[PDB]
Design an enzyme around this catalytic site. Sequence first.
Site, PDB file in Angstrom:
ATOM      1  N   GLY A  31       0.813  -1.215   0.000  1.00 18.32           N
ATOM      2  CA  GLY A  31       0.000   0.000   0.000  1.00 18.32           C
ATOM      3  C   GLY A  31       0.844   1.260   0.000  1.00 18.32           C
ATOM      4  CB  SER A  32       0.138   4.548   1.521  1.00 22.71           C
ATOM      5  OG  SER A  32       0.375   5.890   1.192  1.00 22.71           O
ATOM      6  CB  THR A  33       4.703   1.380   3.049  1.00 25.04           C
ATOM      7  OG1 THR A  33       4.510   0.134   2.368  1.00 25.04           O
ATOM      8  CG2 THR A  33       3.881   1.430   4.348  1.00 25.04           C
TER       9      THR A  33
ATOM     10  CE  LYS B 181      -0.183   7.395  -2.104  1.00 23.82           C
ATOM     11  NZ  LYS B 181      -0.805   6.343  -1.280  1.00 23.82           N
TER      12      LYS B 181
END
Length: 504
Positions: free
Chosen positions: A247-249, A251
């Site tokens: 997930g956002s880790t 980005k």
Amino acid sequence: QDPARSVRHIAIPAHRGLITDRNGEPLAVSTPVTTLWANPKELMTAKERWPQLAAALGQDTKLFADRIEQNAEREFIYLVRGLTPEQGEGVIALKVPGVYSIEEFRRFYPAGEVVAHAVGFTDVDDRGREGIELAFDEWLAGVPGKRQVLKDRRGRVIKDVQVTKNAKPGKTLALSIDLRLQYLAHRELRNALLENGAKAGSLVIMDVKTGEILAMTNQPTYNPNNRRNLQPAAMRNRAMIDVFEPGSTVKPFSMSAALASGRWKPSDIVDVYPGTLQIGRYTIRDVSRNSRQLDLTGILIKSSNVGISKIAFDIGAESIYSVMQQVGLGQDTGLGFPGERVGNLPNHRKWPKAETATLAYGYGLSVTAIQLAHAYAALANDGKSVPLSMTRVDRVPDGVQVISPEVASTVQGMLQQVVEAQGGVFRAQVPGYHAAGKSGTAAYRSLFAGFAPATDPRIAMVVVIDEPSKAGYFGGLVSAPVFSKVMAGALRLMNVPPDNLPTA
């Protein structure tokens, strides 16, 4: 008739090599034990001794007698393996005809459950089954010797003939693990699971300069010294085996590609209103949808899937895939732990828009906690990715410069703002230091990945809390306070100076 004399072979077990932590604290130690074997043909002449012998072996009188009787035509059976040397000398002192002994070793694990998965344990044959004991089995085991004894026609030992091959002792191994940091990580991860009612979790700490794994803990854990009742859930080395979409880790890796493209700078603005983006049939959605213009740091603070997707469409998926591959996401760690999972990093010749966007915000690839920590280590190490090590590193290997130092430094500053700035990950703040990091959601996993000190990084860390089901002491991301507590202690245990000077 069989020969009156024959020369029979007995293996000489080798002493398994000592495992220590990086400071020399013992983690796995070979402990002398005594194995007893017998010649049933001789035992059969001394039946009145059997019950005393059975008792000394901790075996039932009749089950013991049945076993000897059913093997009466054999000349070798094991009676018991791995008695204490004291228990052994007691059995030997009974002077039962046909009873013989072999000196062997069995492992003891002085730190027990604290480093259970990383060290692992040996099987009944003193062979590595899990963790480092498995990964380095051949190194640790050495090579058994062989010796000859002269036996008579009925297998009675007359004397020792010679040793034909000496045992080669197993070799010592110093892990990269720092038991001081491992204890801190173990304790805080255990406490976090209890307070969050979680199923499981992992925590990895890495030295970003050396590639060393300084701590690797999972919950549940187990005592390798007493595995009677150990449930398979507890035995799982989740940090190396559990795969998840990060997930956002991820980005920050998409951002690194954006800054390397020549097309983006941190002060650039992306309009993410209304928190969704339609691409054909597919809708990209942000979890929080209260934004219009965000700068690049804002996209990270708000975990804007929409914002990173618009950037990804501009720069192309290939550039993001390249960074992610080069930092090791979905790639072999090289650690050589049998059964370690590699996960997957999707590739395409023509990247469909949905696959481009989801890659950029961390879905559709699957990684482990070790890989995520190694990726953050490269970012923290000014863009240089040093190969992972579970063993003490004295001479630091070259790393691959996967991200330019300038781009890495810029992203470090952005991630410092994710932790420090208003609207950021408040409970990831590390008192007395500046820290940097990123949250994500992998029936969910709470993820936090980061490093510190933010302006001169030394340590990278990943926290994974699997299925939190109870409210903890603080609000916000479940994994954030664990990062805070563990980073605060780890930095001080390593004597890392604070980087939050009064403007010097």
